[PDB]
Amino acid sequence: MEQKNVRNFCIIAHVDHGKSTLADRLLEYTGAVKMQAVRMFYKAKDGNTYKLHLIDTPGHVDFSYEVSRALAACEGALLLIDASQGIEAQTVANFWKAVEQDLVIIPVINKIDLPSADVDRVKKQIEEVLGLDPEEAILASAKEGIGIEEILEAIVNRIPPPKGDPQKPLKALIFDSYYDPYRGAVAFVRIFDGEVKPGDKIMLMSTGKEYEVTEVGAQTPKMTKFDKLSAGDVGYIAASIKDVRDIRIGDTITHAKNPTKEPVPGFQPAKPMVYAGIYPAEDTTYEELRDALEKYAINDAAIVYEPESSPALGMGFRVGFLGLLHMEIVQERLEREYGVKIITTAPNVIYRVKKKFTDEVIEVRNPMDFPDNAGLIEYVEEPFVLVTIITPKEYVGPIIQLCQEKRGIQKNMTYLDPNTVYLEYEMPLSEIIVDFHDKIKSISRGFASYDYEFIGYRPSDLIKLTVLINKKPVDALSFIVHADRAQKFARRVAEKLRETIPRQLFEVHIQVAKGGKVIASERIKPLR
Numbered sequence: 001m002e003q004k005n006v007r008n009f010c011i012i013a014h015v016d017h018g019k020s021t022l023a024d025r026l027l028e029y030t031g032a033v034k035m036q037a038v039r040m041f042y043k044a045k046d047g048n049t050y051k052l053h054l055i056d057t058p059g060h061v062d063f064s065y066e067v068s069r070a071l072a073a074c075e076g077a078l079l080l081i082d083a084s085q086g087i088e089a090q091t092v093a094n095f096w097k098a099v100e101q102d103l104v105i106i107p108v109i110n111k112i113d114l115p116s117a118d119v120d121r122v123k124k125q126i127e128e129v130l131g132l133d134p135e136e137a138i139l140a141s142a143k144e145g146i147g148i149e150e151i152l153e154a155i156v157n158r159i160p161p162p163k164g165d166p167q168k169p170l171k172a173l174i175f176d177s178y179y180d181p182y183r184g185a186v187a188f189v190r191i192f193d194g195e196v197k198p199g200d201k202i203m204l205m206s207t208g209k210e211y212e213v214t215e216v217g218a219q220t221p222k223m224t225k226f227d228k229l230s231a232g233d234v235g236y237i238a239a240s241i242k243d244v245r246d247i248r249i250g251d252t253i254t255h256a257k258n259p260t261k262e263p264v265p266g267f268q269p270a271k272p273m274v275y276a277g278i279y280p281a282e283d284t285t286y287e288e289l290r291d292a293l294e295k296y297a298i299n300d301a302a303i304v305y306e307p308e309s310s311p312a313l314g315m316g317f318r319v320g321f322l323g324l325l326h327m328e329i330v331q332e333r334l335e336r337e338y339g340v341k342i343i344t345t346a347p348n349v350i351y352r353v354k355k356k357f358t359d360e361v362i363e364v365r366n367p368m369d370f371p372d373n374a375g376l377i378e379y380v381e382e383p384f385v386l387v388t389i390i391t392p393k394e395y396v397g398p399i400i401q402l403c404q405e406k407r408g409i410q411k412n413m414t415y416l417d418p419n420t421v422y423l424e425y426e427m428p429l430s431e432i433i434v435d436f437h438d439k440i441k442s443i444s445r446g447f448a449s450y451d452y453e454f455i456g457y458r459p460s461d462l463i464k465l466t467v468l469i470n471k472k473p474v475d476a477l478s479f480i481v482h483a484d485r486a487q488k489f490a491r492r493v494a495e496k497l498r499e500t501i502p503r504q505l506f507e508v509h510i511q512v513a514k515g516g517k518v519i520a521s522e523r524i525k526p527l528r
């Protein structure tokens, strides 16, 4: 009558395979603040109309958890594959994350209008690699509109409808959020059990905090207030919440008065993985910078930052990101929407250091916090990740060689077809966050894709290198490198500066040191 006519799905596509486009198709084909919890109605060939909820999902590995949550809020997913490219890194990673949630995956080959397009290719891959029936695949072109209905049909027919009870205690999964200046901290939620209407007293199961709902509704696609949200629904909720960290993604929203036995599984707070110091550039100032960050941080529950200063650089901030894209985003967004101009140090992972006389192991986020006294270090550990790569046979050698150089241990190798190779390497994260994205693209003509997952901390032989410009060290220029790779980084970084420094009067001497010892030098002569 209502919840048996509901379809909760999301679009799972690798980078640039058509995810955003196809979404427009669906609304257009159905109609007559970021995009999320989009609700639309559809008249199927079978007769009645259905309530469809399109949940938006992050693409980059940086938001893997958040993607896992978005998936948790659905019954099915459309796995979008570009017929010209085929299965790529994310396509496979996302597939499995979707499988881990028992979602009905509906394959969708897009861009079949392309000359370069090759379906029997993708269908072959789908079967051999994904283990899916090539026959379930939906051929389609979003650029046009070929197969759109064919798609809405698949969703309705193949994807089961929600299955919770609206009479049981409220149980709603938070899969997204954002700060609304007028509504406050808002949470995009999927409702499994019960219902929620304005005025109700909800509670956040991880924190124990209670709030009074002020409004509920969904993107239709405009923020549309409703009288309520029932089991099986997807929408938003407002309850005068101070900020987005109070409604953490993956958290559960029940009733304060009568709560549900347990909370939806898999809650994990935000865990910054990569850090970097951000200093005020040009004429931008510490205050303006400190100000923009406080303004940004409202629309970001993942980011953390603390004041750090340098003798050379001055006053700035040590900021933690989920990964490289998140950081990139935060930068683009700051220089843009805030005008502030910032300089950013090289990124670094959090290290776990055990030093003598200190029972507790210290976590290093800022390299300058790393013990200058090597002998006082009992050991050091750094995060490792499992990197998966997809590439044409031709590029395998250079790639493998690239990986080996950066300390990657090949764990597996296979063929997604006679010309495409699949690879699994175990390498330090510290090595992936440094010129690995460009170098693999450079050597693969942009044809090789890759994804990776954190697989824990492993003890390693790392050291601290210091940078001195004319015999004068720069606290914020020091970095932690593997002892064996030290010389090379020493040299690289040396040249980077030989160029990065603007020729002034005297002679700018640059030295990279390994605990006293100098292992790299670069001196760019005087002024003219």
Ligand SMILES: Nc1nc2c(ncn2[C@@H]2O[C@H](COP(=O)(O)OP(=O)(O)OP(=O)(O)O)[C@@H](O)[C@H]2O)c(=O)[nH]1
Pocket: 013, 014, 015, 016, 017, 018, 019, 020, 021, 022, 059, 110, 111, 112, 113, 114, 140, 141, 142, 143, 144
């Ligand atoms: N020729 C052709 N191009 C398409 C088709 N679908 C999408 N594109 C184009 O592919 C490019 C990227 O499409 P998007 O919809 O942005 O793909 P996306 O997954 O949203 O990209 P990201 O937002 O980075 O994840 C754009 O030029 C789209 O118009 C298609 O069916 N045929």
